Amino acid sequence: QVQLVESGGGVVQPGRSLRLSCAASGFTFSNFGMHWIRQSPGKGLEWVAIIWYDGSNTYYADSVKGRFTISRDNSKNTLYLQMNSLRAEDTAVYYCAKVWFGESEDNYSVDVWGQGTTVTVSSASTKGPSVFPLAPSSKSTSGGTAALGCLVKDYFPEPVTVSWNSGALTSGVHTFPAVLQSSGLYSLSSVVTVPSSSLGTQTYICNVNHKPSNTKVDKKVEPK
Amino acid sequence: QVQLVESGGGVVQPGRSLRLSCAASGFTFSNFGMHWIRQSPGKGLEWVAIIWYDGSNTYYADSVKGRFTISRDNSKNTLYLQMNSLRAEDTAVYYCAKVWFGESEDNYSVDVWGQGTTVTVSSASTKGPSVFPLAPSSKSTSGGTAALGCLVKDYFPEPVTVSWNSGALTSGVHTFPAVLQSSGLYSLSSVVTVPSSSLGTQTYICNVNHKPSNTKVDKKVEPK
Amino acid sequence: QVQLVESGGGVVQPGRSLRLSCAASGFTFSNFGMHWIRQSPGKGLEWVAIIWYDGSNTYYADSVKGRFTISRDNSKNTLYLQMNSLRAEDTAVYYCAKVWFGESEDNYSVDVWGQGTTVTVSSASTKGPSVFPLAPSSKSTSGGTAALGCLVKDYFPEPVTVSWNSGALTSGVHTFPAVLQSSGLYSLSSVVTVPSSSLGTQTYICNVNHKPSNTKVDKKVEPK
Amino acid sequence: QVQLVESGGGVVQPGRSLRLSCAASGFTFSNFGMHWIRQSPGKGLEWVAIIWYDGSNTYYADSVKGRFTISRDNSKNTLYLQMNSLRAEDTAVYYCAKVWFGESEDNYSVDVWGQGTTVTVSSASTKGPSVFPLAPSSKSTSGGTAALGCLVKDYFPEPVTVSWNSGALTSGVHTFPAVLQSSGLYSLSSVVTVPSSSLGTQTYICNVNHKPSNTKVDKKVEPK
Amino acid sequence: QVQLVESGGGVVQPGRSLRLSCAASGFTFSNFGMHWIRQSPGKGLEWVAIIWYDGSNTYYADSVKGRFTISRDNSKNTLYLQMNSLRAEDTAVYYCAKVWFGESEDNYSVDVWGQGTTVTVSSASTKGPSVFPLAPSSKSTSGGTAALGCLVKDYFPEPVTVSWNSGALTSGVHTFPAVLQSSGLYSLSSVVTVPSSSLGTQTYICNVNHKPSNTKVDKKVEPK
Amino acid sequence: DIQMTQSPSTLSTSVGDRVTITCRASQSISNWLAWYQQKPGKAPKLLIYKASTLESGVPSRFSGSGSGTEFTLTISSLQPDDFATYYCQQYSSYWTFGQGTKLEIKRTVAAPSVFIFPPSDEQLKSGTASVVCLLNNFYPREAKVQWKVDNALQSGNSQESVTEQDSKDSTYSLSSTLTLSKADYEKHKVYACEVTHQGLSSPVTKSFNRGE
Amino acid sequence: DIQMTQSPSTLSTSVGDRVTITCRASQSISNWLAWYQQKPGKAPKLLIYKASTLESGVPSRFSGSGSGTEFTLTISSLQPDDFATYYCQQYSSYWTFGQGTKLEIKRTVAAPSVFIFPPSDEQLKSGTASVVCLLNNFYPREAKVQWKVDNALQSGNSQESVTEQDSKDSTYSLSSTLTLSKADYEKHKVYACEVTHQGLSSPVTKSFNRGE
Amino acid sequence: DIQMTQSPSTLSTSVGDRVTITCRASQSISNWLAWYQQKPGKAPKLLIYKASTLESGVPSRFSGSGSGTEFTLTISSLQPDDFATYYCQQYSSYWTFGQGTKLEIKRTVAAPSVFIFPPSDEQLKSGTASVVCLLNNFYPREAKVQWKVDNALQSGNSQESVTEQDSKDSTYSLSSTLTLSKADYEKHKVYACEVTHQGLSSPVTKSFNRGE
Amino acid sequence: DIQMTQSPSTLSTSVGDRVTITCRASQSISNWLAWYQQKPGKAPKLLIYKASTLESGVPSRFSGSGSGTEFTLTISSLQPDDFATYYCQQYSSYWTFGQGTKLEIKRTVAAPSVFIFPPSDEQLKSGTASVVCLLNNFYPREAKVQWKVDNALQSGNSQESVTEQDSKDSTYSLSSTLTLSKADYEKHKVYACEVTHQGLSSPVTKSFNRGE
Amino acid sequence: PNANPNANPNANPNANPNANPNANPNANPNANPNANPNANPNANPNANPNAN
C-alpha cells in the first residue's frame, strides 16, 4: 500500500539548518500534493507546509514563514523540507503526509501520514548519563512489597534504554518517560516492585545503555 | 483513416500473465494519449487504464491497480497492457482507444475505439464438444411446422460454428449464443423449423466445427 | 540577417505532384522548427504544416492532411514540402517561415518569413494572349482628354508584361491585375489617358510580352 | 516584509499611451489579487482597477473603462497597467496594492500599498525655470528681521530643487509647493528670514537646480 | 458600447428542435446573468428563461419548462437556448438580454436587449407567391384620384419584397403588413394612388421578390 | 478550428492619425496572439507577439492590447511606411489568421472619369465580344457598375478589376469587362454601363449602339 | 455610485487628546468599511477592516465602531506618530474613498508676519509682473488675503500656496502671487495685499507704489 | 487563524459504551472538518472527512455529525482497538488541529501505593540531591502531590512523569523528582511528599530524616 | 534576455556569522541556478548547482535555497577561506551572471590619513599637471573626495583608484588623480582636496599653493 | 420563524465583484487525472540550448 519514510532528523544547534526528506512509494507520487505536519508536546498538532503536485504553489504556517522551504523531486519521488534559523520551539516530530483524492471544487487535507522523524533543537552537548541508585528501605516497604530503582540523570540526547538483570526481570518494571530540565539535560527513573523477603539475597542491577554516546552502565542497587 | 488493431488475447489460466498489444495507424500515434477499456456482459463497459502521450502519467481503475501495467512504444507505434495475477472476473473484450483532440483546459475521453480482443480467464482445459440430436416428434409439431436441432454441450473454449447440410440449409436456422456453465464448459443449441410433411424423407445433418481442437462432427438427427 | 529562399513553384495539372524547397541561411537552421504557410486571394493566409527542429513531430492542416508531406535536410539546410494529389484550390503563394526563439513553456509561431513561391494548379495549357485594341474616339472623349488601351485576353499562365511604345510612355499608364475566367484563361487591360489633340498624329503602341510562351506583340491603337 | 515597486511613470502628452509596471516581492504574488489606485489633489483617492489572482476577472472604474487595461505576469511577478487615450484629469500618483487574505465569503480590499509612481498628462514641453529675486526692503522688515526670497516661475515639468548658499543656510527657509498655472507651467517661491543688520554685507544667493532639464541657476538677491 | 447579436432563427417544422445563440461584446459577458425573452403578437412580451453568471441557477417560464434549456459558454462569450418539442405558439421574436448591475439585496431585471431573431413554427412548405393585379376602374375612382395595387397571396415563408416600377414610384405607396391565414400561408396587399388623368397611359408594374425561393415576378396592372 | 475576425476590413486613415484595429477569436486563446504586417507583393513581417510584446526592431509607435477573445492593435502616430495590410494570428491551438485589415491612404473625394470601349472588329471576327467600362482616378474605392443591354440589367456575365492606390495621388482605377458571344452580342442594339459613386450627385450612364 | 463623506475635514488636536472622526455612506454598506492612514509623501497603510477589526501590528489605541451608514474611528490617546491623514473606504460595491481627514497639531494662536515683494525689473523686462504677498508663521491656517490695486479688489488673477505644519512650532506660511501683464501692471499705481486673521484685532494692509 | 477546541480533553470509557466527542471552531468552517485517530507512539490515521464521510477501510461503528461551528464524532460501540487519541482538523482556511481527545480505559478505583527514595550519597558527592516520590498502580490518574521540607511547601524545583495505562490492569504510575543543591539539601532535616487521591479518605504522607 | 540581480552588492561580515545573499531573475528560471565563487586574481570555482545541490568537495557549511525567481545562498559559519566574490548564474535560457556579491572583512571604524602631492617640476616641464590626494588605512571603503581649485569644485577631470582590503589590518587605501593642462594649472594658485568619511566628524581639507 | 425557504429567485445573478480574488489555499493540489494527455501542437519546436 502507500508508504512514506522520513529521514534526516536529529539533534541540531539553534540557528543552524537541517534538511528533512520523505521517500514515497506505493502510489504515483508526482500526482499528489504533500504536507509537512509537526507534533510537539507543547503545541500539539501543527501544520507546517503544503506543496502542489507540480510545486507551483506552496504555503507555510505563519510561525515558520520565511525560515522553512518545502520542495520536491518528482523524478526521485522525494519530498524535502529545508529548515533554516531553527529555534528551540521547533523541536517536534515531523511527518510528511499525502493529500487525499477528491472532487475538483472540494477542500483538501491529508489521508496517509508518514512514519515521522524527531527533530531536537537544543544547545546541549552530547553527554553520557549519571546513574544513581534508588535504594529500598523501611520507608519504601508496604507489606510484602518493596520498591527499588535507578535514576538516570543528566544525559543528552534521547533516548536511553534500561533493563534489569540483563532483561531477566521484566514483571513490575516501570520506566518513566524522560523529562526535559531547565539545564537542557534529560533525566528519567526506572522502578521495580520486588518481594520484601527477597532483599539482601536477590541481586538487582540496572543496565543503562545510550547508543549516541556508546554508554553502557551496570549499576547495582543495594539496600541500606 | 484512423485504425487500431488489438492482438494478444486468448485463454489464460487464473494467476498467469498475458500481454496485449494495440497497433495504431492512420495518425501520429506518439502525439496522443491512449485508453484501454474492457467490456464484459456482467459489468458492461469498464475503464481500465490511461497513458499520457509521453508515458509520464498513467492511471488505472481501482479494481486493477497493482496488477495491470500499461505502457507504449512510440518508436513502434504500439500500445501494451501487461496483465498479471489474472482473476476470473477479468474475462472480457479489451479495446484500445485514442483520446480526442481538444482544448488545453478541457477534460478528455476517447473518440476512436479499436477492434477489440477477447480474453477468457478460466481454469478449464481445451475440450471438444458433445453433439446430441434434438429429435422432432409429435411433441415438437404445431400444424405443418416442426422443430429439430442439435445440442452442442460441454466444450471449451469459444467459439464453435454450426451449419446445416454443410451450409446448404440456412432458412429458419437459429443458433443461440453460448452460455457459460458452472463447470466452466460452454453449451448452446441450434434449431431449425421444417415442414412436417418432409420428415422421414429429407435428411438433416448438423455440422459442428471447433477450430481450437480441430473438431468436426456431422450429427444426423432422426425422428422418433 | 535571416534569409529564406523558396523554389520549385510553377504550373501543375490537377492530380499531379510537386515538391517545394526552402533554402535557409543567416542562422543555425538545424536549431529551429519551420512552418509552411500559404496565401491565396480566396482564403487569405492559411497555415499548412509545421516540422520540429529534428523532424520528430510534424503537423498538418486538415485540408491537406494525407496529401502533403513536410520534411527537412539539416545537412543541406533545406526544408521540403512534397505535395501530392493537388486540387484547384491549392493554387496559392507558399512561404516558409522560421519559428521564433522563446521560453520553454510558451506557445510558438513564426517571426521571419521567406520570399514566397507561386504555385498554380490548373488544367489549362500554355497559350499566348490575344491583343485587342481599345480604340479612342469621340465617344470616349471628354474635353481635351481621351482614353485608349489594349485588352490582353485568354492567356495562360501568369504573368504578362505590358509596356507602351517600348517604354517611352509611362505617365498615366494603368495595367490592371489579371483576372481568372471560367475557362481557366486570364485576361487584363492596360489603359492610358492622352491629350485628345494628339489623336491621329501621335502613335500609340502597346508591347505585350509573355516569356512562358515567348510571345511578343506590338499592337498599334488607332482612332475610329 | 511585503514590498511593491512601481515604475514607468512620467510626463506624457494627452492622447498618447503609457505603461506602468509594479514589481512585487516578499510574498507569493501569484496567489493574490491586485489593485491599481490613484490619488490626485482634485479627486483625492480613486480606485482604478482590480485583477484576480489568475487574471480571469478584471474590473475597472467607470471613468476609465475602455481606456485602461490591467494585466499581470505571474511568471515575472509583475503587474501592468496599459493606459491609452489619456486625458488631463488622469494626472495622478498611481499605486499598486495587494488584496488582504480573508474568508471565502467576505468582501475584499487592499492591505499593502506600493510606493507609487507619478503620471503627469500635459501638452507642455520641457522648459527650464525663470528665477527672479524677491528683494527685501523697508516694507518687508519688522524689527531686526527681514524677509527675502526667490520666485521660480514658468517651468515644466516637476520637480525643482532650491537651496540657499549651497545648503549652508537652512534655518528659516520656506519653499512653497508648486502650483499649476493656466499656461501649464509650474511656479513656486522660496523665502527666508534673516537679521536686518546683516543686509548689504552678508551675501544671499539661491541655487535652483532642475534635473529634468539640467538647469542650474544661481541668483543673487540684493535689497533695494 | 454593449452589443448583443442573436443568430440561429428560421423556419422549423413542429416537433423539431432549434438552437439559438447570442454573441455578446462590449462588456464582460462572464460577469453577468442573462435572460431570454420572446415577443409574439398574440402574447406580447413574455419572459422565457434566466441564467446565472456561472450557470449555477437557471429558471424557466411555466409554458416552456421541461422543453427549453438555457445555457452559456463563457469561454466563447456566447449564450445558447436549445428549444425542443416546439409548438405552434412558440413562433415569436426571441431576444437575449443582459441583467443590470445593482445592489446585493435588490431584485434584478434586464437593461440591454439584443437585436432579436425570428422563429417561425409552421408545417407549411416553401412556396412562391401568387401575384394578382388590383386593377383600377370606375369603382375605384373618386375625383381625380384612383387606386391600383398588387395582391401577394399564399406564400411561405417570410419575407417578400415589393417595389413599384423598379423602385421609381414610392410616393403614395402603402404596403400592408402580412396576415397569417388559416392555411398557414401569408398574404398582403400593396396599393398606390395615382392621378386619374394618367390612367391608360402610364404603365404600372409591381415587382415581387421572394429570396427563399428565388422568385421574381413583374406583374403589370392594367385598367378595365 | 478557431475562427478569427478583424474589424474593420478597410480603414482609410491619414498620416499622424491614431489607428486602432480589432481582432476577435471564436473562443478563448489566452494571450497567444501575434500581429503581422504585409506590404503588397512582399512577405509578411512580424510586429507583435504574445498580444502585447513588441518585436525587436519594431518602432515604438506600435502597441498591442487585449486578452481572452478580443485584441486590438494601436498605432499612436501613423507614418507613411505603415500603410500596409495587418493580420492577426492566434497560436493557442494550431494557427489561424484573420482576413486582414488594409490601411488605406485617406484623401479628398474625387469623382471618376468614365469611359466605355466597344469590342474591336478583330475580336468580333474571333467570335467573342468584350465591352470595357473604365472608371479612372476616383476615391473612395466603393462604386457600383451596372450593365444594361437594351435597358435590361445584366448579372453574372461581367468581371471587375481594381488597381491599388496610385503612389502619386492615392486614387483608384477600375475596369469592368462584359464578355458575350458574337451571337448574343449581335442580338441586341444598345449597350450601356451605369456608374454610381459617393462622389457623384447623380448616376453616370454611358452607352453605344452596336455597329456604330 | 456610493458616496462617502468624512467629518470633520480638518481636526486640530493635541497629543493625549481623545479623537473621534466620522464617515458616512449615501446608502447601506453593511460593515464592509476600511480605514487607511497616510503620511505625507508616503504610501498609505491599512489600519482597520470590517469597520472594527484591528490590523496586525496596529497599536491598540485605535478602534472602530459603526454599522449601516454611520461609522466612527476613535483614537483614545493621540501620539506623535499618529499625525497623518485618515481615509475611510467602503468596499461593499466597488471601492470609493472619502476625501480624507487631516489631524492637525493644535497650538496657541500666533499672528502672521506680513511681507510684500514687487516684481523685479528683469521680470518686467520679460513681459510679466508677479507680485508676492507672504504670511509667515501663523496659526490657525485660516486667513484671508485680498489684493487691491488702486483700491480695486482683484478676483481670478491670483494663486495661493500653503506649506505644511512647521516641524519646530507647528505654524503655517502662505504665499499669494498676483500675476499681471507688463502693460496692465504699468497701467496702475498702488498695489496692496490686505490680511485678516483671528489673531488680529484689525486687518493688516501692506502696499507699495509702482516705481517707488 | 481558526481556533479549534475539543471536549472533553480526556474521556474515561469502557468497551461497549457509546462515546461522543465534540469539537468547536471559532468561526464557521462549513463542513470542511476531518477526524484523525492516533495511537500512542504511532502515526495518525485518517478516519472521517467532510465531517461525515467514512474513509475506505474504516469500520462502520464510527460516525460524524455537525455543521458550522459544532461537530461531533460518535463511536456506537467501543472496541479495544479504538483506545487512542482523536484529533479534529478544520481545512476550510489553512489547517488547524484541536488539542486532541484521549479515550481512556475505565476501570475500578485503586488507591496508590506510595514510596519515597532519598538522594544517594554519590549524587550528594556530585553536588545535587534528588528526592523521588513514587505513586504506583492507581486509578484514576488525577492525584495531587505536595512537597514539604520541614513542613515548608516546595515550588519550582520538582518535575513529574506519568506512565501510560498498564496493558495488564490499566493502572497508572507517577514519579515526582525534587531537585536541590547539596547546600539546600543539608540545610534541612525532614523531607516529605503528601499525596491526595479520590480513592484515599485521608492524604498519605511519606517522609525521611536527613542522615537517618 | 533574462536579467539577474544580486543583493547586496557588498556585505561586511565577520568570521562565525551566518551569511545570506540573494539573487533574483527577471523571469522564472525554475531551479536551474548555479553559484560560483571567485577569489581575486583567480579563476571562479563552482559551488552549487540546481540551486541546492552541493558540488563534491564543497564543505557542508554552504547551502542553497529558492525556486522560481528568488534564490538564496547561505553560509552557516563564515571561515577565512570564504572571503571572496560570489556570482549567481541562471542556466535555464542561455547563460547570464549576476553582478556579484563581495564578502568584505568587517572591522572597527578607522579614519583615513589624508595626504596631498603637487605636480613635479618634470611633469610641469612635460606639459601636464597631475595632483594626487591619498587616503591611507581607512574603513569602511565609502568616502567622498572633492577637488577644489581656488575654491571651485572640479568635475569630470579626476579619477579614483582603490586597493583591496589589506591582508594585515583589512583597511583600504584610495588615490585620486586630478589632471590638468600646464596652462590651466598655472592659471590658479590654491589646490585642495576635501575628504569625507563616516569615521570623520568633519570634512578634512588639505591644500597647497602653486610654487610653495 | 416561517420565512421563505427558497430563492428569491430574482436575486443577484452577477459577480460580487468584491468576492474573494485570491487563490484558495485549500484548493485541489492533485493532478486532474482526466486532463490533457495529448502532445501540444503549439509547444517548443526548437532545440534547447542548455540540453546535454
Q: Does a cis peptide bond (omega within 30 degrees of 0) precede residue F140?
A: yes
Round to whole Å and give the CA distance between I48 and J17: 47
Interface list for J 7-36 with B (CB within 8 A): 31-36
Which residues have a C–N gap over 2.5 Å right after them in chain F?
none
Contact H43 A95 (CB under 8 A): yes
- The angle at the Cα of E31, spanning E29 to E35, to the nearest 5 degrees, equals 65
Same domain, G65 and G140: no
For chain D, the domains span 3-121, 130-220
Residue B10: closest CA among B158, B216, B129: B158
CA B186 from centre of chain: 12
State how far residue D1 is from chain H, nearest Cα, in angstroms. 20
Report the SS3 class of residue I81: helix
Expressed as residue numbers, the domain containing H142 is 113-209
Round to whole Å and give the CA distance between D126 and D10: 12
Q: Does a cis peptide bond (omega within 30 degrees of 0) precede residue B159?
A: yes
Count of alpha carbons within 13 Å of I13, Cβ hemisphere only?
25
Tell me the DSSP string of chain G.
---EEEE-SEEEE-TT--EEEEEEESS--TT-EEEEEE-TTS--EEEEETTTEEPTT--TTEEEEEETTEEEEEESS--GGG-SEEEEEE-SSS-EE---EEEEE----BPPEEEEEPPPHHHHHHTEEEEEEEEEEEBSS--EEEEEETTEE--SSEEEEEPPPPTTT--EEEEEEEEEEHHHHHT--EEEEEEE-TT-SS-EEEEEETT-
Assign 3-state DSSP to chain D and report helix, strand, coil percentages, each to 5: 10, 50, 40
Residues near B164 by beta carbon (within 8 Å), at least 6 away in sequence:
B170, B173, B190, B192, B204, B205, B206, B207
Joined grid coordinates for residue G130: 508677479
The answer to whether J39 touches C57, Cβ cutoff 8 Å, is: yes
Contact A59 J25 (CB under 8 A): yes
Round to whole Å and give the CA distance between H26 and H19: 24
Same domain, I71 and I11: yes
CA D146 from centre of chain: 32
Residues near G160 by beta carbon (within 8 Å), at least 6 away in sequence:
D179, G145, G174, G175, G176, G177
Q: Looking at this protein, which amino acid is placed at residue H86?
A: Y
The answer to whether A205 touches A213, Cβ cutoff 8 Å, is: no
Residues near D74 by beta carbon (within 8 Å), at least 6 away in sequence:
D29, D30, D54
Burial of B34 (0-12, 13-18, 19+ CB in 10 A): buried
Round to whole Å and give the CA distance between D36 and D82: 11
Residue-level length of chain J: 52
**With contacts defined as CB-CB under 8 Å, which chain D residues touch F19?**
none
Residues near G17 by beta carbon (within 8 Å), at least 6 away in sequence:
G77, G78, G106
Per CATH, the number for E130-221 is 2.60.40.10
Rg (CA), chain B: 23
Round to whole Å and give the CA distance between F81 and F72: 20
Is B104 at the interface with chain F, CB within 8 A?
yes
Cell numbers 419572459 correspond to E47
Is H2 at the interface with chain A, CB within 8 A?
no
Residue I68: closest CA among J32, A58, A53: A58
Joined grid coordinates for residue B20: 496485449
Burial of E141 (0-12, 13-18, 19+ CB in 10 A): middle
Residue-level length of chain I: 212
Same domain, I128 and I100: no
Joined grid coordinates for residue I117: 602631492
> What residues form DSSP beta bridges with I59?
none
Joined grid coordinates for residue B214: 480441430
> What residues form DSSP beta bridges with H13?
H105
Same domain, F129 and F190: yes
- The angle at the Cα of E36, spanning E92 to E109, to the nearest 5 degrees, equals 125
Contact D69 F76 (CB under 8 A): no
Positions of E strands within E62-129: 68-73, 78-83, 92-99, 110-113, 117-121
Per the rule left: phi > 0, alpha: psi between -120 and 50, beta: everything else, I18 is beta
Q: Looking at this protein, which amino acid is placed at residue A204?
A: Y
Q: How would you label I115-133 residue by residue, b for 16+ Cβ within 10 Å and e otherwise?
A: ebebbeeeebeeeebbbeb
CB neighbourhood size of A64 (10 A): 22
Q: Which fold has domain A130-220?
A: Immunoglobulin-like (2.60.40)
CA C16 from centre of chain: 20
Residues near B62 by beta carbon (within 8 Å), at least 6 away in sequence:
none
What strands, in cross-sheet order, belong to the sheet with I172-181?
A: I113-117, I128-138, I172-181, I158-162
By CA distance, what is H165's nearest residue in A?
Answer: A174
Q: Looking at this protein, which amino acid is placed at residue D169?
A: L
Residues near J3 by beta carbon (within 8 Å), at least 6 away in sequence:
none
Same domain, I98 and I13: yes
Round to whole Å and give the CA distance between D79 and D96: 8
Round to whole Å and give the CA distance between G117 and G175: 11
Number of domains in chain I: 2
Residues near A41 by beta carbon (within 8 Å), at least 6 away in sequence:
none
Cell numbers 469459444 correspond to B158
CB neighbourhood size of I6 (10 A): 19
Report the SS3 class of residue C165: helix
State how far residue A115 is from chain H, nearest Cα, in angstroms. 6
Residue C104: closest CA among G125, J48, D204: J48
The answer to whether B46 touches B61, Cβ cutoff 8 Å, is: yes
Joined grid coordinates for residue G58: 496596529
Joined grid coordinates for residue F165: 492606390
Round to whole Å and give the CA distance between G139 and G142: 8
Residue C107: closest CA among B104, A216, I176: B104
The answer to whether F181 touches C196, Cβ cutoff 8 Å, is: no
Residues near I101 by beta carbon (within 8 Å), at least 6 away in sequence:
I6, I7, I8, I9, I10, I11, I21, I85, I86, I87
The answer to whether A187 touches A174, Cβ cutoff 8 Å, is: no
CB pairs under 8 A between D and E: 5
Joined grid coordinates for residue E33: 446573468
The answer to whether E137 touches E151, Cβ cutoff 8 Å, is: no
Residue D110: closest CA among D24, D18, D42: D24
Rg (CA), chain H: 22
Q: How far is CA E203 from CA A22, C55, E172, E208, E223, in A?
A: 99, 75, 16, 16, 10
Burial of F57 (0-12, 13-18, 19+ CB in 10 A): exposed
User: Among G41, G73, G105, where does a domain finish?
Assistant: G105
Contacts of A among chains (3+ CB pairs under 8 A): B, D, H, I, J
Report the SS3 class of residue B212: helix
Contact B108 J37 (CB under 8 A): yes
Residue A69: closest CA among A78, A77, A59: A59
Query: What's the farthest any 2 CA atoms get from each other in chain C?
Result: 73
Joined grid coordinates for residue G207: 502696499
Residue A79: closest CA among A25, A119, A16, A26: A25
Q: Which fold has domain A3-121?
A: Immunoglobulin-like (2.60.40)
The answer to whether G199 touches G111, Cβ cutoff 8 Å, is: yes
Round to whole Å and give the CA distance between H113 and C109: 86
Residues near E106 by beta carbon (within 8 Å), at least 6 away in sequence:
J12
Joined grid coordinates for residue B13: 489460466
Round to whole Å and give the CA distance between H80 and H57: 17
> What residues form DSSP beta bridges with D94?
D38, D117
Long-range contacts (CB closer than 8 Å, 24 or more residues apart) made by H160-165:
H160/A179, H161/A176, H161/A177, H161/A178, H161/A179, H161/A188, H161/A189, H162/A176, H162/A177, H163/A174, H163/A176, H163/A177, H164/H40, H165/H104, H165/H105
Interface list for D 41-100 with J (CB within 8 A): 50-54, 57, 59, 99
The answer to whether C97 touches C185, Cβ cutoff 8 Å, is: no
**Pairing verdict, β I158-162 and I113-117:** unpaired
The answer to whether E127 touches E156, Cβ cutoff 8 Å, is: yes
Give the dihedral sign, CA I82/I83/I87/I88.
positive
**With contacts defined as CB-CB under 8 Å, which chain D residues touch J21?**
32-33, 50-53, 57, 99, 108
Joined grid coordinates for residue F200: 457623384
Interface list for E 21-60 with D (CB within 8 A): 28, 30-31
By CA distance, what is J7's nearest residue in E?
Answer: E57
User: Among G49, G83, G105, where does a domain finish?
Assistant: G105
Q: Looking at this protein, which amino acid is placed at residue B168?
A: A
Report the SS3 class of residue C7: strand
The answer to whether E96 touches E114, Cβ cutoff 8 Å, is: yes
Round to whole Å and give the CA distance between C51 and C108: 12
Nearest to G163 among D106, D112, D174 (CB): D174
Q: Looking at this protein, which amino acid is placed at residue D95?
A: Y
3-state secondary structure chain F: CCCEEEECCEEEECCCCCEEEEEEECCCCCCCEEEEEECCCCCCEEEEECCCEECCCCCCCEEEEEECCEEEEEECCCCHHHCCEEEEEECCCCCEECCCEEEEECCCCECCEEEEECCCHHHHHHCEEEEEEEEEEEECCCEEEEEEECCEECCCCEEEEECCCCCCCCCEEEEEEEEEEHHHHHCCCEEEEEEEECCCCCCEEEEEECCC
CA D210 from centre of chain: 14
Round to whole Å and give the CA distance between F191 and F127: 18
Q: How far is CA A102 from CA A51, A148, G37, H34, J31, in A?
A: 17, 56, 44, 14, 11
Joined grid coordinates for residue J39: 502532445
* Residue E155 parent element (H or E): strand E145-155
Q: Does a cis peptide bond (omega within 30 degrees of 0) precede residue G8?
A: yes
State how far residue D6 is from chain F, nearest Cα, in angstroms. 19
Burial of D132 (0-12, 13-18, 19+ CB in 10 A): buried
Distance separating the N- and C-terminal Cα atoms of chain A: 57
Round to whole Å and give the CA distance between B131 and B148: 14
Round to whole Å and give the CA distance between D2 and C208: 76
Round to whole Å and give the CA distance between C42 and C169: 34
Phi, psi of A89 (to 5 degrees): -75, -5
Query: What's the farthest any 2 CA atoms get from each other in chain H?
Result: 67
Joined grid coordinates for residue A48: 507546517
Q: How far is CA G119 from CA D136, D152, H164, in A?
A: 12, 13, 96
Contact G32 J17 (CB under 8 A): no
Cell numbers 495531587 correspond to H144
Report the SS3 class of residue A138: helix
CB pairs under 8 A between C and I: 4
Nearest to J10 among E53, E101, E108 (CB): E108
Q: How far is CA E104 from CA C224, D62, G29, G54, in A?
A: 84, 19, 10, 26
Round to whole Å and give the CA distance between C11 and C20: 12
Residue H101: closest CA among H145, H53, H43, H37: H37
State how far residue F106 is from chain J, nearest Cα, in angstroms. 39
CB neighbourhood size of E159 (10 A): 12
Round to whole Å and give the CA distance between F42 and H39: 78
- The angle at the Cα of C88, spanning C85 to C94, to the nearest 5 degrees, equals 80
Round to whole Å and give the CA distance between A18 and B202: 95
- J36, J40, J42, J44: best mutation site toward chain B, by most B Cβ within 10 Å? J36
**Pairing verdict, β D11-12 and D117-121:** parallel
Give the dihedral sign, CA G143/G147/G152/G157.
negative
Joined grid coordinates for residue D166: 549651497
- Experimentally, the structure was elucidated by cryo-EM
